[PDB]
Amino acid sequence: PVVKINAIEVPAGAGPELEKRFAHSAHAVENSPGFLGFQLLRPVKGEERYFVVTHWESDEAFQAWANGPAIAAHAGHRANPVATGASLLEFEVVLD
């Protein structure tokens, strides 16, 4: 499988907000094909960015999400966004 990590940047004190958005909004992509579920990681030390860690059977699994329903997902939340940045770190799973 592959892993996509998204380092999301959130101004101070808006992590609860960004958190309520994964909960009280649309945490729904677990029926995307090849999706193996994600973790949302709140930073405590070494870090100030939220990490979204997602596993997938393949990269084509990932691209089905990104290049399909993601471009149009969560329009309102992205029209009024709480995040101020992101980076997509992309890996191959070599051990477990």
Next chain:
Amino acid sequence: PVVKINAIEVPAGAGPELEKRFAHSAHAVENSPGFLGFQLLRPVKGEERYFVVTHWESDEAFQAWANGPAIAAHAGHRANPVATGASLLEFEVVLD
């Protein structure tokens, strides 16, 4: 009216590609409400970024585009993008 300028960053030699996309690939949003048409500016000196200069009757006119049909527009082109960056510079038209 207001003016939104988008400094699009494009790697070397892909300005023709980004140009075919504004021409032969859906240059169409001139019937978006409050839209007053755009110019696409190819840089020659002082600059390496393409500028998209758009005028609008109001910012709400602009937001109708961005927060409406733009989050879902040109999906394929954004799935295979030729640009590597952008910035939204926003102004009020004070003289003309």
